[PDB]
Amino acid sequence: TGLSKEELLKVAGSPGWVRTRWALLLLFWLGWLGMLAGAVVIIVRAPRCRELPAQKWWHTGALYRIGDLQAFQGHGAGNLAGLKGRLDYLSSLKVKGLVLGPIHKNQKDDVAQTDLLQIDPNFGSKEDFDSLLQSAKKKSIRVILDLTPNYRGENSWFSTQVDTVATKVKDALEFWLQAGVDGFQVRDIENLKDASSFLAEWQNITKGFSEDRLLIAGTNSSDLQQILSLLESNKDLLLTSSYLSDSGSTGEHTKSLVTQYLNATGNRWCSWSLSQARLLTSFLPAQLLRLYQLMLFTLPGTPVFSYGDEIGLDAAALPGQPMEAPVMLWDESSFPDIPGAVSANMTVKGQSEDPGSLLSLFRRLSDQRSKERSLLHGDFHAFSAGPGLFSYIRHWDQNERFLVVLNFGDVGLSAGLQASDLPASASLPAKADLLLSTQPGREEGSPLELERLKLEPHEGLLLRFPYAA
Amino acid sequence: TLLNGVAIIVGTIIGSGIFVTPTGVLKEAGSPGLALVVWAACGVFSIVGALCYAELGTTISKSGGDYAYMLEVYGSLPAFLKLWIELLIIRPSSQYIVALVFATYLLKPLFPTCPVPEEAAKLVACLCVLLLTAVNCYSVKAATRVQDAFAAAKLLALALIILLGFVQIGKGDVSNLDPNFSFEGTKLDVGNIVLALYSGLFAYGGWNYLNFVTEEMINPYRNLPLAIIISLPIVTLVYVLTNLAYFTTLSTEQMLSSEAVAVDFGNYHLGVMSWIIPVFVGLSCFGSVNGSLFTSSRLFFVGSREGHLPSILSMIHPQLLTPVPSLVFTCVMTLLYAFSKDIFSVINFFSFFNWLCVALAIIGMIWLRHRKPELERPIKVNLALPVFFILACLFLIAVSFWKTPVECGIGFTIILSGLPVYFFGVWWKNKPKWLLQGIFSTTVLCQKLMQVVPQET
Numbered sequence: 001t002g003l004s005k006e007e008l009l010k011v012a013g014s015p016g017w018v019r020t021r022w023a024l025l026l027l028f029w030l031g032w033l034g035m036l037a038g039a040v041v042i043i044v045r046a047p048r049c050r051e052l053p054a055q056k057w058w059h060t061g062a063l064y065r066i067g068d069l070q071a072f073q074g075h076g077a078g079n080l081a082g083l084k085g086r087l088d089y090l091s092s093l094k095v096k097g098l099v100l101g102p103i104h105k106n107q108k109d110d111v112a113q114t115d116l117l118q119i120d121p122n123f124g125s126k127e128d129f130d131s132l133l134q135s136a137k138k139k140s141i142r143v144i145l146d147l148t149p150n151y152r153g154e155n156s157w158f159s160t161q162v163d164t165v166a167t168k169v170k171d172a173l174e175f176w177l178q179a180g181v182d183g184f185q186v187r188d189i190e191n192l193k194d195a196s197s198f199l200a201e202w203q204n205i206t207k208g209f210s211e212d213r214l215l216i217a218g219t220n221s222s223d224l225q226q227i228l229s230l231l232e233s234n235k236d237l238l239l240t241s242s243y244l245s246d247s248g249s250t251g252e253h254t255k256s257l258v259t260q261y262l263n264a265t266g267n268r269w270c271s272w273s274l275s276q277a278r279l280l281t282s283f284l285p286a287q288l289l290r291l292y293q294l295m296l297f298t299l300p301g302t303p304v305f306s307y308g309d310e311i312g313l314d315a316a317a318l319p320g321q322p323m324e325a326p327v328m329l330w331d332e333s334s335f336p337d338i339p340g341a342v343s344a345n346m347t348v349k350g351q352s353e354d355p356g357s358l359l360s361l362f363r364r365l366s367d368q369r370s371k372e373r374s375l376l377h378g379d380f381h382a383f384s385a386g387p388g389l390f391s392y393i394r395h396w397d398q399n400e401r402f403l404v405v406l407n408f409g410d411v412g413l414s415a416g417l418q419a420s421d422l423p424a425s426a427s428l429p430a431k432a433d434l435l436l437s438t439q440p441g442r443e444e445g446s447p448l449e450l451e452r453l454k455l456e457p458h459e460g461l462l463l464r465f466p467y468a469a
Numbered sequence: 470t471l472l473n474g475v476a477i478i479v480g481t482i483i484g485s486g487i488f489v490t491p492t493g494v495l496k497e498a499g500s501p502g503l504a505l506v507v508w509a510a511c512g513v514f515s516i517v518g519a520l521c522y523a524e525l526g527t528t529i530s531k532s533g534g535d536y537a538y539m540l541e542v543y544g545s546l547p548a549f550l551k552l553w554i555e556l557l558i559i560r561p562s563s564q565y566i567v568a569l570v571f572a573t574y575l576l577k578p579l580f581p582t583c584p585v586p587e588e589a590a591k592l593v594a595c596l597c598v599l600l601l602t603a604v605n606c607y608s609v610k611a612a613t614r615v616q617d618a619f620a621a622a623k624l625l626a627l628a629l630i631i632l633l634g635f636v637q638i639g640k641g642d643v644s645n646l647d648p649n650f651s652f653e654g655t656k657l658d659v660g661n662i663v664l665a666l667y668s669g670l671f672a673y674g675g676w677n678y679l680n681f682v683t684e685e686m687i688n689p690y691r692n693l694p695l696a697i698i699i700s701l702p703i704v705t706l707v708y709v710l711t712n713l714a715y716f717t718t719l720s721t722e723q724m725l726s727s728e729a730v731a732v733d734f735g736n737y738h739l740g741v742m743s744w745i746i747p748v749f750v751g752l753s754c755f756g757s758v759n760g761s762l763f764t765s766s767r768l769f770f771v772g773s774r775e776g777h778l779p780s781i782l783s784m785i786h787p788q789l790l791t792p793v794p795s796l797v798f799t800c801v802m803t804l805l806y807a808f809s810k811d812i813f814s815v816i817n818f819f820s821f822f823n824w825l826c827v828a829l830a831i832i833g834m835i836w837l838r839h840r841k842p843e844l845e846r847p848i849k850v851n852l853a854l855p856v857f858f859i860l861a862c863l864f865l866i867a868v869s870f871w872k873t874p875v876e877c878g879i880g881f882t883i884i885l886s887g888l889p890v891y892f893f894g895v896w897w898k899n900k901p902k903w904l905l906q907g908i909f910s911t912t913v914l915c916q917k918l919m920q921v922v923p924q925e926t
């Protein structure tokens with residue numbers, strides 16, 4: 001066995017080997033403390049964390065407007081308990097709320113015979129309503145109660161004396177919060193005299209019980225300056241309007257509205273909806289339906305939708321139907337008046353199996369909006385590109401970055417995405433993976449080149465690329 | 470003793486890989502429905518494996534373990550090739566993971582929502598090892614007291630996760646997740662399932678070379694094979710309850726994002742949240758590379774005595790004696806895995822050769838059931854049980870060339886490097902005689918360098 005023995009070693013290992021043993025021992029704890037602070041250097045000159053901005057429940061996904069229950073289901077089932085089975089579909093969409101109503105007692109056009117506290121018995125009773133809230137709250141879908149008083153007439157706010165009309169609203173906010181609703185909505189407040197004083201008082205009342213409650217409001221106004229008068233003293237007030245509803249159909253015109261409405265408010269929470277009551281097919285042609293959706297689910301704010309917006313519910317494509325509240329379609333047996341006027345593609349069921357349908361587009365987008373921390377509360381910066389485009393970037397602290405490319409014209413172009421203005425924290429790479437498209441005909445997963453990106457007429461793109469430098 | 474056969478053997482098999490691997494099964498299964506199945510399918514598979522070693526540890530039972538069990542069966546360059554793998558692949562890389570996890574649970578309480586940089590988690594991993602390999606070059610009897618305080622911390626963490634995960638469902642909103650969306654779905658049946666199994670199989674191991682000394686010191690004599698069938702379902706019980714604290718209190722996107730799941734449970738659950746969880750998870754991972762350095766030296770004494778593994782190793786220091794050339798050899802190989810890219814690229818690299826080393830050890834049992842009977846088996850299991858084990862274990866490896874063959878490509882590269890140093894090792898003709906003086910020259914230089922003397926021959 002090849003060695004030097006215990007006693008023969010103690011002869012040979014002593015002389016000056018003690019000093020080269022104490023030297024290698026002392027070089028250890030220096031090379032250890034050298035690696036110690038050499039790690040402590042990296043932990044101090046490391047980029048820290050943005051703290052997370054205390055989100056509320058409506059920040060995290062779309063809402064859903066349901067005005068006519070009658071349509072919402074059909075005939076025979078147009079009630080609250082028949083609505084209660086639809087939450088399996090509403091959680092199929094991953095919404096976070098429901099604009100529900102108005103459901104109170106409105107005969108017609110009368111102040112003394114319109115009580116906001118009593119339900120209308122064409123829907124059910126309070127115990128049916130408490131069944132709805134309790135069944136919804138198990139799936140974590142909140143319920144927002146619409147309180148527009150004259151929801152059956154021409155003027156919504158009873159053109160005679162108004163301080164008793166607001167007094168009816170003053171106690172109705174107290175009543176339904178005790179039943180446990182999580183938000184309200186008034187509408188058409190251009191028919192309200194002195195809107196900005198009553199809204200700010202009701203905002204003091206909606207926040208008067210807790211802070212997990214919101215108060216949406218509507219108007220038909222598309223004036224950028226008129227909205228800000230309403231948002232003057234009120235800042236934690238959502239406000240949907242017809243601001244995006246006027247078309248133009250061009251990107252730089254659309255780019256101008258989104259940037260200015262963000263610039264004039266600064267950086268608060270918006271609510272990106274085309275109108276206050278109607279659908280998207282009221283204001284868009286047949287090929288732009290696939291293209292807004294994506295933009296709506298990606299802008300900084302709460303997208304607000306109506307029923308049928310995910311299936312392309314067109315009232316013009318189906319005669320014998322009320323424009324205000326079209327047949328909530330579901331299947332082929334959904335339009336019972338004229339059979340054969342509904343194709344397979346049109347209902348909820350026929351599109352729920354096609355991976356290229358418009359409803360299939362809605363579930364992928366509402367997925368990513370409710371999970372990706374960039375699209376939740378990342379910051380918004382758009383940049384310039386070609387003449388008929390609108391591109392922008394969502395990006396938070398160190399998470400996944402997103403890139404949206406929209407072509408609002410019918411001429412096939414290239415990108416020309418000159419950044420030239422973005423920070424290094426949101427600086428573009430050369431290549432980035434593709435997440436989805438609106439038109440089929442792309443390789444989902446392959447990293448495309450942005451300088452050699454060619455666009456098709458009416459095609460949206462959502463891409464992604466990680467945090468790097 | 471009846472119950473102490475289980476209480477010793479439960480804390481042995483509960484490793485610190487429970488703080489790592491829930492993220493790794495979750496990103497290879499999809500939903501917590503199919504994720505909790507993998508924790509149960511790894512539950513049953515290791516009762517089968519520990520029975521195959523509860524009998525095979527009792528037949529031969531020389532000294533030196535899994536190596537020496539194969540030394541009886543093959544007794545040649547297959548024995549050295551099994552030794553060349555464990556010094557280089559299994560024992561280094563499993564210690565790096567526990568060291569790397571010690572870093573990320575220490576640097577993640579001050580990086581709450583962001584990701585720890587790769588270059589700083591390695592230099593706290595290396596620091597943890599080099600600090601801890603130098604304690605074991607000092608006093609062993611001082612390091613054994615250090616082994617005491619880390620068993621208690623590994624159990625206080627894994628109970629306080631449970632009792633906070635228990636009251637979180639009992640306070641209100643029962644079935645707060647109820648997610649099983651890919652319990653029937655997101656299942657490739659070959660690629661992603663096996664990769665989810667490797668994370669589950671890592672999560673408790675050491676039912677192989679750790680139980681034979683566990684039974685021996687009390688001598689309760691062959692009531693141990695029930696005593697593991699009592700024991701390992703307790704471990705699968707605890708490893709499934711801890712995921713139930715994860716999938717309810719966290720989300721499926723907050724889990725797959727982070728590197729330290731246990732602090733995300735700790736952050737949401739309490740506001741103290743810093744004196745409790747990354748301490749107790751931090752002490753628990755700090756012990757599994759400590760006690761991997763006590764037991765590291767045993768292998769060298771067995772290999773050098775048999776004529777393998779040149780005799781510079783298996784020499785012990787004078788004053789404050791400790792196997793000094795061996796611990797230096799292990800910590801060097803441990804830090805050579807700091808050139809690695811991802812931690813779950815290491816667990817897939819570790820568990821390839823772990824589960825081929827196990828599978829050839831049990832194929833060698835059947836060929837010792839076929840050939841050479843009447844070897845006085847105190848325990849013989851039903852022979853239909855080990856053939857359940859190999860046919861699964863060939864299924865893990867054969868899919869692991871369909872999936873990531875490049876790391877297994879450099880894994881078979883390193884074991885063709887053990888072949889010429891075998892022929893240089895023992896087969897070599899000592900004819901030229903220039904080198905025989907040099908082998909004696911190189912060896913006595915290190916002895917003078919470290920002050921280490923041979924065993925009492």
Ligand SMILES: CCCCCCCCCCCCCCCCCC(=O)OC[C@H](COP(=O)(O)O)OC(=O)CCCCCCCCCCCCCCCCC
Nearest residue numbers: 002776777778779780781794797798801890893894895908
């Ligand atoms: C890294 C840790 C350093 C601290 C510990 C010192 C350990 C020194 C040896 C390290 C390797 C130990 C395993 C060797 C493999 C097993 C061999 C065996 O079992 O032989 C038994 C055999 C029997 O020893 P005996 O029982 O003591 O007679 O020992 C030897 O043959 C020693 C042979 C040493 C050389 C091995 C072959 C190397 C070939 C490639 C050399 C390349 C050098 C680098 C070139 C320049 C690069 C810049």
Ligand SMILES: CCCCCCCCCCCCCCCCCC(=O)OC[C@H](COP(=O)(O)O)OC(=O)CCCCCCCCCCCCCCCCC
Nearest residue numbers: 021024025031599602603606607793797800801918919920
């Ligand atoms: C930046 C990279 C990190 C810095 C260096 C990384 C690698 C350092 C070496 C390995 C890590 C050492 C851990 C600490 C070990 C000593 C701890 C201790 O206090 O023990 C008391 C121990 C006993 O005390 P004594 O009674 O004073 O001897 O001290 C020693 O025996 C000296 C140990 C120091 C050895 C450091 C260098 C290792 C020599 C390797 C020789 C390689 C050439 C030979 C050929 C083989 C290669 C093929």
Ligand SMILES: *[C@@H]1O[C@H](CO)[C@@H](O[C@@H]2O[C@H](CO)[C@@H](O)[C@H](O)[C@H]2NC(C)=O)[C@H](O)[C@H]1NC(C)=O
Nearest residue numbers: 196197198199200201202203204205207233234
């Ligand atoms: C509640 O609405 C009022 C009236 O629009 C807002 O104005 C506050 O009025 C109260 C009345 O005493 C004053 O104490 C506050 O100083 C006013 N605003 C400020 C600067 O706090 C008020 O902003 C609304 N909500 C609150 C009270 O913040």
Ligand SMILES: *[C@@H]1O[C@H](CO)[C@@H](O[C@@H]2O[C@H](CO)[C@@H](O)[C@H](O)[C@H]2NC(C)=O)[C@H](O)[C@H]1NC(C)=O
Nearest residue numbers: 154155188190191219220221222223226241242
């Ligand atoms: C909101 O809708 C009304 C309905 O057409 C628009 O027209 C106003 O109608 C009321 C009575 O119906 C008149 O008293 C107003 O004078 C009408 N407005 C104008 C400008 O003539 C109304 O304009 C719409 N609001 C906006 C901001 O466009």
Ligand SMILES: *[C@@H]1O[C@H](CO)[C@@H](O[C@@H]2O[C@H](CO)[C@@H](O)[C@H](O)[C@H]2NC(C)=O)[C@H](O)[C@H]1NC(C)=O
Nearest residue numbers: 258259260261262263264265266267381382421
């Ligand atoms: C809109 O945002 C821009 C900053 O991006 C600002 O606009 C500046 O307005 C001043 C005064 O009108 C000009 O002198 C600057 O040249 C403008 N800068 C740019 C980049 O346009 C401002 O913060 C916002 N605009 C307004 C009217 O407030």
Ligand SMILES: *[C@@H]1O[C@H](CO)[C@@H](O[C@@H]2O[C@H](CO)[C@@H](O)[C@H](O)[C@H]2NC(C)=O)[C@H](O)[C@H]1NC(C)=O
Nearest residue numbers: 286314317318340341342343344345346347350
């Ligand atoms: C179901 O979708 C199909 C195809 O989009 C529609 O059928 C097309 O209708 C358009 C009307 O503009 C015609 O120009 C095409 O020739 C039709 N395609 C075929 C293959 O005939 C159909 O209308 C949709 N369903 C309903 C009820 O409208």
